[PDB]
Structures are given as structure tokens and as C-alpha cells.
Write a protein that binds this DNA or RNA. Structure first.
Ligand SMILES: [Mg+2]
Ligand SMILES: [Mg+2]
Ligand SMILES: [Mg+2]
Ligand SMILES: [Mg+2]
Ligand code: NA
Ligand code: NA
Lengths: 74, 177, 53, 136, 175, 104
RNA sequence: ACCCCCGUGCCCAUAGCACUGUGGAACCACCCCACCCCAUGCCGAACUGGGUCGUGAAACACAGCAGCGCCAAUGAUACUCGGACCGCAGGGUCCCGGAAAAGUCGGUCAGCGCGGGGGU
RNA sequence: UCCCAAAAUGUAACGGAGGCGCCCAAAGGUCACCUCAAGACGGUUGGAAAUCGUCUGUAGAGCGCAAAGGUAGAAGGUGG
């Protein structure tokens, strides 16, 4: 059926090396793909958001469990 | 009450027959679980209390009324509903019921010849094929509800079948020679 | 949010003395009677609070 | 010939050959030099002619089952959606793909079977021999 | 097969009758580039169970054994070939094909002799003594007779690789 | 079986906590009550009951706790977060706790 | 400084299983008892309380083993950015760079810290 | 919710499939605790499945419904 349709969104919002801020949202997902790392809190829809300022660092331990972190500048 | 002949009449007759360099490697009896059928072709809420009481006087230990496996096929199956009874006997009561069985259970059975000598559980264990329940010293048809069949399984700490059979026999188990 | 003769009924929130509305959708399916709760209005807080009207 | 239970509909696209050796399950084989679609009835025709030519044997290998549902034009118009749920199935064939293979019969007895089947295919083809030994 | 240059750019190879080949073992892995005709004449005989003298431009005769060929599609002419420098004691496992001699007693009766597996890979071929063929009795067979690798004579000093109960040859019924 | 211990590891946050964890190994008759740093895979105080015990193996529960806290004083420890394993916070382990909570 | 054991991390299969050997009171485990604190919708199996013997059999630790897993080149090819063409078309080629998967060689059954303990 | 969608996002058609207009006083909060499907071997109202037990088992289950993502250290199952 050519009926129904859904715009949807999702994806990563703050990539690597990006200097974020306390409140910015990092990535929007549906499950636990990118898991909350150091200085990275996780909303109810599995959304990652920053707790302070820093540099978005990415971390891949061979797929399976992704992690994002933040290293302050100062 | 038992236990003594459990060791004295078993372990010593192993290092003189087989060859154990350790007394801990000597086959032991871990536990005796007893399963009880109920429901399926006989869905009765009154039948629950039946075994629920009998089993609780033959072994001196309240049994748990397990449910279904959450599988629905084509015939009479559901999701969750009491359809079985587990009666684990490990410890002193294990030895009690056990003795009560070797001494009064098997010997007192109509048309009794023995139990299948062939090695059952090839992993070091052994299963029994008990049917009629009117062969026990605790089961009195003069004060019950009906007649069912109970299933007794033997769980031991044996490594091989050659080391299990002997354990059973020495402890107390006749075969059909 | 359709409201009809069917099951469950949007139940109000009241208090002894206090004056507060939690507004919680309940149901009459299984247990439907003991809708007694505890919700602190804008008084001294911590007060006998039920949603049963 | 036709699949036993799938989804229903499909798409369309051709890329270079992928999984067709030269000598598999038998001595002689037949390959495409042209990329196309092979209707199941075409296969059936081939298989059958090959049977005629080989009274006894049954050593005819056909590993190009048709797994592609194609739609069709009901009557006319164009108002309405996905049409012709069941018309025919196809078996995409790319150059290099081994469609047919046989064994047991001589040299002359293969040129014939193959030559015949070939007059039922929507693309040119060729016959080869043993000389390749990739994976086994 | 007199080997000449051996660059990395196939610019002076596609035009002329040259085919890109490589060779290795465990030490050196220098890429080569052999003649088309030479290979198409030699690989036809020794195939994958026979080494040939490979003299590189300068005076370097290095013995090797064909391992995996990556022939071209749409054409019968190969395009790439992998070589393995045989050691001395235990090189790599070689694949030996299965032929058939003597008329069977089931082919006459009405059935047909069918080899289920042409090529058969074994273990430890043994250098200097690589089995270029394999002779398996077929006459002892009748109708529905299955002959596995437990029935194939060993060329002395060779052990099998595949499962002992795998059907190599089988005589199928007519029709 | 080895799940219990790992329910208390992932559970106690290491980063956001900033605090120090204090593990305890009492699956037998020889506790370690080691003390480890959040970030650094090092060890600060860390008690030890294998060095004498005065013929005791159950009483010393209260001792190695007390000891521990005392030891912590010589380094500068104030906040502790407790990470046991298959231990349902009953007797011995609880002794270690109280001893190391009111002695520090 | 030597080794070893126990605990706890980094690392989260190139550090995993299977087979096999070694270990016997320093440590670890099984075992023994267990009316009570506590507890298994039944059973102190496991949780747990109090501790001898015995044993190391099992589990655990270490070591051998790479049969199977896991990881995984070189060479070539698939595909492709860009540049320029061919067939009615499905399609396909050339130049210039990037560059797989699979398979093959081979690679190794870890490595790197902190703390405590007991031995030479 | 998938696919189309051509690897950020987005993107049409009377293109290709399937759902919702609820439900749960607990299916919430928190705190503890348990580990699945399946097959084999062996057992009595069974003789396909299941009830039991012993093995194997990165989950081939489960998560109220549709689907994808995600989950074994739980977002699986129970109790105060
Ligand atoms: Mg196209
Ligand atoms: Mg997209
Ligand atoms: Mg795109
Ligand atoms: Mg638009
Ligand atoms: Na282009
Ligand atoms: Na290129």
C-alpha cells in the first residue's frame, strides 16, 4: 500500500573533535548503540547530552559497544 | 540411621576394585529429584491438592507446583498454568526417603523383577521408572483421592557409567540378572 | 484520548484539607477501588491524598 | 521452475557476473556471453529438449532456479497500483554464469544437446571444457 | 617459463601476451610476470600437482608449485596466478584429481558411472613425490555402490584430508 | 554465578562518583578489603588479614575493618563507597563495614 | 632482586573451547556441622553461620598442545571520485587516483599495572 | 515502523508490507533475587510438544500489541 509515511530524524548531532557545551545534545538514537561515556549523560530515548564543556571524543572497541566522551580544554 | 553403611560399605570397595587415588573422587549421591504429573489430559483443581498432600507425606518436604513452559501448539497447551511437580531431595531427607525406598519401596512391589540394568544417563547419572504409587509405606489407598504415577530420578557425582552402576548396586539396588 | 462507556475512567485528585489535582488515568479492570495514594500539595506537604472521587 | 513461497514483488538491475564457475557437477557446461533475464518456461524448454536428446541418463544439472517475480498489465488504464502479482518468474543471468551442465556423453553428444537448448535462449552462449580448478 | 621484468604497473602487460603472476612461501614475496602462451602450455600438463623450473631474469632458478588461479570471466584466458615455492619436507596441502580406468560392471548393466568429486585434497603430499593423478578401481562397482576415500589406495607416504566416509564415485541408475 | 559481582561493579559509577571504592573478598576465611582508586588502577591503603589472625577467622571481621579505616587516616581518606560481590550484606561483611565507617 | 598465590584493573577472543599434565596445609576449593540472626514461592544446592580431618578428584591457578575457533598479509580483481567515449537498448569500455569482501600465506592460546600474603 | 531513500539529514507516486485511536494498581518508583529458546540421553495418566534431571547453549528467547533499533553486567522473570 502506497499509504502511510514517516519523516523521522535521528543520527549523530555532535561529531568528533567538536567543542561542545553543557546542554548540547550529542547523538540521537533508538536503542543503546552509542553508550554514555565519561561526561556524557543519557536521556530517556537514549539520547546523549553533555554535562560540561569539552571536546567530543569518540571511542570504538571493535564495534558492539560505542562510547562517547568529553575532555575539557582550559 | 544410614550414612555409616553409606561410606563403610561403598568407598573401601572402590580402591580395592577400581583404583581411586582420592577419596573425594569417590562417586557420591548429589540429590534425588522427583517429578509429578498433573493436568494436560486431566485438568482438575481438586487433583492439585491430591499430590500436593501425598508427596508432602512421603518425603516430608513441601513440593513446588511448576507451571507450563509458555508454549502453545495445536492440542491442549496454554501459556502459564500449574502442570507439574518438582520434589528435590538433597541432604538428610534424601538419605531418609532413599532408605525408605530401598528397604520398603522396591522390595514391596507386585510383579517385581528388578530395574533395567542397561546404562541410562551416560554422563554418570541414573534414572528410575516408577509407576503405580500403591507400593509405598506412606501411600494408603484407604485415605486418599485416586491413583497416579510418580517419577524418581537419581543424581550422583559419578564421572562414568562404570562408576555409577556399582555405586547404586552397593548402596541398594537390585537388577534383572 | 477517546472517552466512552468502555473500561478505565480518568479519575480526579483530592485531599483532606489540601487542594490539589494530580489527574491520573486509572482503570476498573482488575483492582479498581483502592485508589488511595499520597501527594503533597502546596501546604505543609506529606498529606493523606487519594484520587478516588 | 517456480519458487514455493516468497514475498511477492521485486525490482530490476544488472551487474557483472558473480558466482558461476566453468566446470561444476559434470564434464561439459554452457555459459552466457550476454546479460539477460531467463524465464522459467525457457529453462523448462531447455531441460526438456536435453531430455529428448538423452534417452537415458538423467545426469542433467540445472543450477539456475528462477527467483524473480515479474508483474504484468491487467487490461489497460493506469489508475491503480502494483499490477500483475503472478505473471512469470525469472533467473537473472550474467556473462560467465553456468546455466547448464551435463556429463557421461561423448563430445558430439554434447554439441547437440547444447546447440539445441541454445536456440531457446534470448542470448548467445558457448560450450567449454575442463581446465579450471578454483575452490573445491 | 623464462621470467623477465616484474614491475607493479600492468601497462606493458595487457597489450603484449603477458600474464601477471606472483610467488611466495614464508620468506621473500617478490611479484613476477610470466608469459601467456608459456603458462597456457605448461599449466595444461602439470596443473596443480607438478612443479616447473622458474628462471628469473639473471640466473635465479626457483622451484614452485601452482596454488590458486584467478581466470577471467567472459573469456577462457586466465588473468592471474598464485605460486607456492615448495620447501623440502612439509609444504602446503595439494589437491589431487580423481580419474577412472577400466569399464565398470554397472555401466554395462544399464547404470552410469558418476564421479561425485573430481578434485580431492589430501594431507602432506610430500615434495619431489607429488601425485599428478589418482587411479581408483571402478569395476568392483555395480548398482548403487558407493566408494569413499577409505577405498582409495594411497600413493605411499600420503594421508587423506576429507572425511573418511565421503562418496567419491557412485554409479547412478539409468534415466 | 559470576554475575552478582558484576552487578555491583557496573552499578557503582566510577567517573561521576569521583569517590574511592573499597572492595572485599570474603569467599573464604581470608579477607583483603583492598582499596582502589577510581581512575588510576592503583591501590592506596588496602588492609591484610593473612599477617597473623590470633587463631581467629570470623572475629577478625571487625578487626580488618577498624585496621583499614585507621590505615586510611595515614593517606587522607574521607569518602568511601563499598563494593562487595556475592555478599548480601549480612554479618561478617557488615562488621567490616561498621568498623570501617565509625573508625574513619 | 626470584618465583608463586590471592584480590582488583587496563584490555573487553591474534588474550576462546576441547584434550592433557603439574600443584597439596602459605593460599584456594570441595567437605563437616548448622536449634538460632539470614534464606531457597520446595529443599541451608546457592545465599549463610560456625570450623577439624581428608582430598586436589571436581572447580580454580599454571604449563604443554594451535585439531577447531579468533585475528589476518602480499598480488590481483569487484566497486568508485574525477576526466573522456560506445550500443536501439538491456549494457559495456578507456585514462587517472582511491580502494573491498572472500580466499590464500601466515600469525599467535595474550600482553601491560597496583595492592596484600607466604616461601628461597 | 521498515523498504524505496541511491551510506549526514531530508526526499514523491492510486510504489512495495504491517500496525495505532490502547493498555498496566501494577507491567510504576526503589531495593533484592533469579537466567532463556532449542536438541540430545533417560523417565510414570505422556509415547509430537510439555511436566523432571543431567549436559550443550552470546541468547538461535523474552520484552502487553506493528516493526526496526536495542538489550546477558538487563530495558527477561519474581518478592518486600
Ligand atoms: Mg542500471
Ligand atoms: Mg538516509
Ligand atoms: Mg546519500
Ligand atoms: Mg517532494
Ligand atoms: Na564516471
Ligand atoms: Na583502477
Amino acid at each position: 500500500n502506497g499509504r502511510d509515511s514517516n519523516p523521522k530524524y535521528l543520527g549523530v548531532k555532535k561529531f568528533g573533535g567538536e567543542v561542545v557545551k553543557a546542554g548540547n545534545i550529542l547523538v540521537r538514537q533508538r536503542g543503546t548503540k552509542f553508550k554514555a561515556g565519561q561526561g556524557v549523560g543519557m536521556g530517556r530515548d537514549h539520547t546523549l547530552f553533555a554535562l560540561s564543556d569539552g571536546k567530543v571524543v569518540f571511542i570504538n572497541k571493535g564495534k558492539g559497544a560505542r562510547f562517547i566522551s568529553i575532555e575539557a580544554a582550559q | 540411621q544410614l550414612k555409616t553403611k553409606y561410606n563403610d560399605q561403598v568407598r573401601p570397595a572402590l580402591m580395592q576394585q577400581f583404583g581411586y587415588s582420592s577419596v573425594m573422587a569417590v562417586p557420591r549421591i548429589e540429590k534425588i529429584v522427583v517429578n509429578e504429573g498433573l493436568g494436560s489430559s486431566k485438568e482438575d483443581s481438586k487433583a492439585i491438592d491430591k499430590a500436593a498432600k501425598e508427596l508432602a507425606l512421603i518425603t516430608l518436604q513441601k513440593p513446588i507446583i511448576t507451571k507450563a513452559k509458555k508454549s502453545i501448539s495445536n492440542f491442549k497447551l496454554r501459556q502459564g498454568m500449574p502442570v507439574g511437580i518438582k520434589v528435590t531431595l538433597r541432604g538428610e531427607r534424601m538419605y531418609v526417603f532413599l532408605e525408605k525406598l530401598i528397604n520398603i519401596g522396591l522390595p514391596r512391589i507386585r510383579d517385581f523383577r528388578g530395574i533395567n540394568p542397561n546404562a541410562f544417563d551416560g554422563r554418570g547419572n541414573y534414572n528410575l521408572g516408577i509407576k503405580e504409587q500403591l507400593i509405598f509405606p506412606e501411600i494408603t489407598y484407604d485415605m486418599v483421592d485416586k491413583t497416579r504415577g510418580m517419577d524418581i530420578t537419581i543424581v550422583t557425582t559419578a564421572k562414568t557409567d562404570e562408576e555409577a552402576r556399582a555405586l547404586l548396586q552397593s548402596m541398594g539396588l537390585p537388577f534383572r540378572k | 484520548a477517546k472517552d466512552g462507556p468502555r473500561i478505565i475512567v480518568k479519575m480526579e485528585s483530592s485531599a483532606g484539607t489540601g487542594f490539589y489535582y494530580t489527574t491520573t488515568k486509572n482503570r476498573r479492570n482488575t483492582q479498581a477501588k483502592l485508589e488511595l495514594k499520597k501527594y503533597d500539595p502546596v501546604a505543609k506537604k506529606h498529606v493523606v491524598f487519594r484520587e478516588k472521587k | 521452475k517456480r519458487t514455493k513461497f516468497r514475498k511477492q514483488f521485486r525490482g530490476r538491475m544488472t551487474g557483472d557476473a558473480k558466482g558461476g564457475d566453468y566446470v561444476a557437477f559434470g564434464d561439459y557446461g554452457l555459459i552466457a556471453m550476454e546479460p539477460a533475464w531467463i524465464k522459467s518456461n525457457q529453462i523448462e524448454a531447455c531441460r526438456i529438449v536435453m531430455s529428448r536428446h538423452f534417452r537415458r541418463g538423467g545426469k542433467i544439472y540445472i543450477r539456475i532456479f528462477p527467483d524473480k517475480p515479474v508483474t504484468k498489465k491487467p487490461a489497460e488504464t493506469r489508475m491503480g497500483k502494483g499490477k500483475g502479482a503472478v505473471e512469470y518468474w525469472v533467473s537473472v543471468v550474467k556473462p560467465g554464469r553456468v546455466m547448464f551442465e551435463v556429463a557421461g556423453v561423448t563430445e558430439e553428444q554434447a554439441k547437440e544437446a547444447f546447440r539445441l537448448a541454445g536456440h531457446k535462449l534470448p542470448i548467445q552462449t558457448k560450450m567449454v571444457k575442463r581446465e579450471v580448478y578454483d575452490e573445491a | 617459463m623464462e621470467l623477465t621484468a616484474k614491475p607493479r604497473t600492468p601497462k606493458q602487460k595487457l597489450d603484449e601476451s603477458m600474464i601477471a603472476a606472483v610467488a611466495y612461501n614464508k620468506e621473500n614475496n617478490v611479484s613476477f610476470a610470466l608469459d601467456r602462451k608459456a603458462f597456457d602450455r605448461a599449466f595444461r600438463q602439470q596443473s596443480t600437482t607438478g612443479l616447473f623450473d622458474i628462471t628469473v631474469e639473471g640466473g635465479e632458478t626457483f622451484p614452485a608449485l601452482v596454488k590458486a588461479v584467478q581466470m577471467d570471466k567472459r573469456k577462457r584466458a586466465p588473468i592471474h596466478v598464485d605460486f607456492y615455492m615448495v620447501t623440502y619436507g612439509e609444504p602446503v596441502e595439494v589437491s589431487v584429481p580423481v580419474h577412472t580406468t577400466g569399464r565398470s560392471q554397472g555401466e554395462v548393466q544399464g547404470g552410469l558411472v558418476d564421479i561425485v568429486v573430481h578434485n580431492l585434497q589430501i594431507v602432506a603430499p610430500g615434495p619431489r613425490r607429488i601425485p599428478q593423478e589418482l587411479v581408483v578401481d571402478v569395476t568392483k562397482m555395480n548398482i548403487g555402490d558407493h566408494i569413499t576415500a577409505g577405498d582409495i589406495k594411497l600413493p605411499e607416504g600420503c594421508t587423506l584430508a576429507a572425511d573418511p566416509e565421503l562418496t567419491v564415485v557412485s554409479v547412478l541408475p539409468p534415466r | 554465578r559470576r554475575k552478582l559481582r558484576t552487578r555491583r561493579k557496573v552499578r557503582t559509577t566510577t567517573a561521576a562518583s569521583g569517590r574511592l571504592r573499597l572492595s572485599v573478598y570474603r569467599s573464604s576465611k581470608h579477607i583483603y578489603a583492598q582499596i582502589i582508586d577510581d581512575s588510576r588502577g592503583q591501590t592506596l591503603a588496602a588492609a591484610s588479614s593473612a599477617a597473623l589472625k590470633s587463631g581467629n577467622k570470623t572475629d577478625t571481621a571487625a578487626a580488618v575493618g577498624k585496621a583499614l579505616a585507621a590505615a586510611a587516616a595515614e593517606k587522607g581518606i574521607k569518602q568511601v563507597v563499598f563494593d562487595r560481590g556475592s555478599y548480601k550484606y549480612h554479618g561478617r561483611v557488615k562488621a567490616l563495614a561498621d568498623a570501617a565507617r565509625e573508625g574513619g
